[PDB]
DNA sequence: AGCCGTAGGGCCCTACGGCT
DNA sequence: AGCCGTAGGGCCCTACGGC
């Protein structure tokens, strides 16, 4: 744990705070271990603006530190008996780091005020590019940070105590909505003053969360963990035809290359999209064990194989012609999609989850076949309105199938972005032999853990919470399907023992619509036209791109086949004109000069083979050149009309619901 | 956490045993939830052969089988309170799924004897070409192995209870020998008899770790991790003059190409590699924070990045020029190299360590330029004796440096492969002022932990085991490199405290010599002559078969380049029966038959580009081949001759050494 | 409550041989 | 005794918002 210094003398010593034990070893590998402590935590730590004290005092990471400095705390804050003048936060360079910082400031701000007030607190300033402390050899990191001769640490300064109170209020306190202003308000896409630090760094850590970890593109629904892990296997060829591949592999690829953080958050976005409880349309393909709806994890990532399912293809569609906007990755050594071109609607299509800071995100799946006829609908009449749409989309379509009682929550969640809607089991009452009924329960609510539920149940029964229920079992099987058996006392109505049920467990349960996603890279909340709208935005420039990118490399092609046509029909002059040139300049040159050609033209003539001289390419260069001309006319044409270009976006997303489309799974009844 | 079966009957209930919760999941996934419980355990289990009881009666995964059967143990053994007529061993399809095999049983029957008496154990066969069970899909394994309509359980059925008494004892006893002679003398290189599947069983596994885990090749001196993994960084082209990489995902590489183990075993074969105080000669090239010789671990794989070493380059050197054999790996959807040709002898060099079963190695690191004055010796002389090579080769030479006292236990250790060395930190006694002195030491034994030795020391100061010390301080630094000072009272004899010390701590520490390494797949205790005779040996074969490699591919270029040539010299002809061929396959038998070309000759000219014919390619097609005709002698005649080709092997580890050989850091005193 | 899902962070048991 | 290194297997805390 806490690694001290020698000297007990405190006014010399400093004690260094780092993320961990990764940290900790390069730090004690590289400090002077005279006068330099080393404390490595554990992460996340507690927020005590937010905790009670019980809570706090029973909290590891913080008891290692009051220990640590030896000055007691509030009341008891005996500041000569500190260890150490010097409390140095050397977090890593992230956003991650940055928010344990305004964790440590809060705790030393709560707990620890007069340390602030004698300067005793500063911040190391540990140099970007490295993952982590645990990145950096041991003589970088003195150097670059511990070294006193060069050094440059950060005291912290307390101007004005009124204005902290309610920063760290504001920051780190409970009531979300004025931490939600505060970053709206500020969001935009020596010695250091503790409150601008705590707003500057608060801030960075909150905008990376909502932009770019918890919250959903509308474009393609994604996140960038996801959107990392498919584009990964997109650019691995890991496709449906081909066999599966290693889990760990792909984690450590998908983690080396576009995702730097914890295998675990790699590896458990990948095992959700691959949950048929899970994805309406799961977009990973899975060989083992991923899990159950018994709240089973996957098997660890080194058992498992994984692969892309056939709709994913349509996610990345098209992606390698110009249609959407690459952007270089983290460390900049590779390029990565900002969006994919998405050729179905997959936020709304998989619906959404996020806790993000200030806020939170919940859209639920849909069926895919209602949502294209929704897109479709919307691209025959801008002006559509919400019910003409709940025509086409009835409402959500979990995986789990289930209920959903009434349609008044989904329409205030659709005009809204905001509603509540109830979930409800499956469940008949039927006859099990010698006068005696049973539940039987055969469909749950979506995110309703089986086995908890069941334990809830056996709870309420053994408290006698509930009355009437005899036995309790799970008859769930591959063979079966979910199958959950409630065996009733005879005589009893077995109908009050369910509505029972529905109100005392997750039996009926609901689900709180808060469709927040990305637009324009800002956190917005949409009601359902504008999250189509989007959609079909993004389609369409999707689709024009990309007819502007197959028009250039077409025009491309026919001016390459344009010089070699030339070239077969001059070739004894091409070759004797080639075979009396020294350098490929003076025959690129000269090629150009007789034969009216570009450098492509004529590079392209250099790069000819010999075997292209066969009797018969002429023509298949001719051939070839003319359906060229007939492919640009009809690409100019739907370049030249929008209307045109829309049309064609209906024939392919009709081509995708026919092909994917498939029949509605929970049942809407009227409530 | 075992998952019972809603129904209550013994009769029809089966429990069935797996290695974990990844295991687990699948198998409740297709189980028949009505009558099959199951209970997974946590990877290999306690050898009750060789456990306390008490140590044993707290042992947490016994107490749960036996929880779960809720029929006691031993004396009160109750059949009749049996929660299951069916005890089915499924483990994984692995050697070792066969160990946990070897080691449940042995806990059956030393203390549930009549579960097996009356036959209520049984062992699943899940089919291979699978980690784990959580790599298979729950119908698969339900219709495979759990399904009672088409698996194909085995009973237990013990036929011989002093056979078995024999052969538990023999194989999970603590007599290292026997299990040793078995070995030996069965190394191979419906119902089931429990004998029968002990045997066989454990055989498999020990089998498996003594060929293919747990010792060095003599060749290339590397475990087949450690070889999977530097090959790897081969593949993937990290060589040093590129950039670190992650060694996250170098481990996942490794893992699902050549390695199928745990990313910890992956990951710190890795590490170890890369650290300075383990490694006499680093293969690996680490960033960050790699650990310390205080035990501080390295830091976890997220973290840090890695590369091969330029040294490494020469282990790797030319494995492209067929210079040894290649292996499918485990599932044939790759191959791997057999052993690395090891351009220096890297068995020696940074020695080997490895408990394996019924036989360990613990080969020392030795000094680069030694070794190879070693080699070059024994390449003038067969028949050189092992004293004439210590003069090449004095001793082994840690990365810690550090001393050796004396030299009968080195010499018994090369003579017969096994031989005691007694190594000592670096101390001195100097002064501090004020007529008082200190310990200062500045080397320690090599795989000592440096914080566990001084906490030792501590120890004894505050038991009063030892007198005389008045503080004790790790001033260690990077600019300092080592320095441990311990304080001595004034007027004490601080040489005296130094020797209670050395009596009493690691600070002096012998190592045990068991040169024990594959030769020609086989584990040999073999002495020094002998590893070097191979490593030459292997050299040998190694340069010969670059050469003869070296050799087909010039002549094939060379052919290629009479035909380019010969087109260029005709190539108006060339044009010509190529612009009135309709068909590349017509222009190809035109060119073959009108110019008495080869297939391929005239495959080369038909893919020549235009741009070759500028008069700048003519002349580089003309001057490659007077080259090649060149190279192509030089080489014949090292074929030609033995000695030719012996002398390039000296000439290219004299080579070798020139660039790599360091001083001697362990001092050897009488 | 405590859970939902991306995030920061980390340690334990077992087998096996041989030396102290 | 318990350490040396490749191996089987697995789990906890924290932040964040909404209900
Ligand atoms: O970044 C990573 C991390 C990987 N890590 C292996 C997992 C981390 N290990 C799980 C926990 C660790 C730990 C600590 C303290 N206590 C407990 Cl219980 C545990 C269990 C296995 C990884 C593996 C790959 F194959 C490829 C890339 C990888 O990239
Ligand atoms: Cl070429
Ligand atoms: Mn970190
Ligand atoms: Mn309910
Ligand atoms: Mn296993």
Redesign the interface.
């Known amino acids: 744990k806490l690694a001290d210094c020698?000297s007990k003398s405190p006014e010399e010593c400093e004690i260094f705070l780092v993320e961990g034990?990764?940290?900790?070893?390069?730090t004690?590998?590289?400090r002077?271990?005279?006068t330099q402590a080393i404390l490595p935590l554990r992460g996340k730590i507690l927020n005590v603006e937010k905790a009670r004290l019980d809570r706090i005092l029973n909290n590891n990471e913080i008891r290692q530190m009051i220990t640590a400095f030896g000055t007691g705390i509030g009341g008891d804050f005996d500041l000569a008996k500190a260890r150490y003048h010097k409390i140095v936060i050397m977090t890593d360079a992230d956003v991650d780091g940055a928010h344990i910082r305004t964790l440590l400031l809060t705790f030393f701000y709560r707990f620890m005020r007069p340390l602030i007030e004698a300067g005793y607190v500063y911040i190391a300033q540990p140099p970007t590019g490295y993952?982590?402390?645990?990145?950096?050899?041991?003589?970088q990191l003195?150097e670059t940070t511990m070294n006193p001769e060069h050094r440059a640490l950060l005291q912290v300064k307390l101007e004005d105590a009124i204005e902290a109170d309610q920063t760290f209020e504001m920051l780190m306190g409970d009531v979300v909505e004025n931490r939600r202003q505060f970053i709206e308000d500020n969001a935009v896409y020596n010695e250091r003053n503790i409150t601008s630090e705590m707003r500057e760094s608060f801030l960075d850590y909150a905008m990376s969360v909502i932009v770019a970890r918890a919250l959903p593109d509308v474009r393609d629904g994604l996140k960038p963990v996801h959107r990392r892990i498919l584009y990964g296997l997109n650019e691995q060829g890991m496709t449906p035809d081909k066999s599966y591949?290693?889990s760990?592999?792909?984690?450590?690829?998908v983690?080396?290359?576009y995702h730097?953080?914890?295998?675990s958050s790699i590896y458990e976005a990948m095992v959700r999209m691959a949950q048929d409880f899970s994805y309406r349309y799961p977009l990973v393909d899975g060989?083992?064990?991923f899990?159950?709806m018994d709240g089973?994890?996957?098997?660890?990532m080194?058992?498992?194989?994984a692969r892309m399912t056939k709709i994913t293809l349509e996610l990345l569609r098209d992606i390698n012609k110009d249609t959407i906007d690459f952007i270089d990755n983290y460390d900049g050594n590779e390029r990565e999609p900002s969006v994919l071109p998405a050729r179905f609607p997959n936020l709304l299509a998989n619906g959404a989850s996020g806790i993000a800071v200030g806020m939170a995100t919940n859209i639920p799946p849909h069926n895919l076949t209602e949502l294209i006829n929704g897109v479709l609908s919307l691209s025959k009449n801008p002006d559509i309105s919400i019910a003409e749409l709940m025509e086409d989309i009835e409402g959500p379509d979990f995986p789990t199938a289930g209920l959903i009682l009434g349609k008044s929550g989904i329409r205030r969640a659709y005009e809204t972005g905001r509603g509540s809607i109830q979930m409800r089991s499956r469940a008949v009452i039927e006859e099990r032999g010698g006068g005696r009924q049973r539940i039987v329960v055969t469909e749950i609510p979506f995110q309703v853990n089986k086995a908890r539920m069941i334990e809830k149940i056996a709870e309420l029964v053994r408290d006698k919470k509930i009355d009437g229920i005899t036995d309790l079992?799970?008859?769930?099987?591959?063979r079966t399907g979910v199958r959950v058996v409630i065996d009733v006392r005879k005589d009893a109505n077995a109908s009050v023992i369910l509505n029972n049920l529905y109100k005392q467990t997750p039996l009926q349960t609901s689900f709180g619509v808060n469709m927040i996603a990305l637009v324009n890279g800002r956190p917005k909340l949409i009601n359902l036209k504008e999250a189509l709208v989007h959609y079909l935005e993004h389609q369409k420039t999707v689709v024009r791109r990309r007819t502007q990118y197959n028009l250039r490399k077409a025009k491309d092609r026919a001016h390459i086949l344009e010089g070699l046509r030339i070239a077969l029909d001059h070739?004894?002059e091409?070759?004797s004109t080639?075979?009396?040139?020294?350098?490929?300049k003076?025959?690129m040159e000269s090629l150009q000069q007789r034969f009216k050609l570009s450098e492509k033209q004529a590079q392209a003539?250099?790069?000819?083979?010999?075997?292209r001289?066969?009797?018969?390419e002429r023509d298949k260069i001719e051939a070839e050149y003319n359906e060229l001309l007939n492919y640009i006319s009809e690409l100019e044409t739907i370049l030249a009309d929008e209307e045109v270009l829309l049309q064609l976006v209906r024939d392919e997303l009709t081509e995708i619901r026919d092909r994917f489309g498939d029949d509605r799974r929970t049942e809407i009844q009227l409530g």
């Open positions: 020698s034990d990764s940290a900790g070893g390069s004690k590998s590289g002077d271990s005279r993952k982590g402390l645990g990145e950096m050899n041991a003589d003195w591949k290693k760990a592999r792909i984690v450590g690829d983690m080396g290359k730097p953080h914890g295998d060989q083992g064990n899990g159950s089973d994890g996957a098997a660890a080194r058992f498992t194989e079992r799970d008859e769930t099987s591959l070739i004894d091409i070759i080639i075979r009396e040139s020294d350098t490929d003076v025959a003539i250099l790069d000819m083979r010999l075997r001289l066969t009797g018969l």
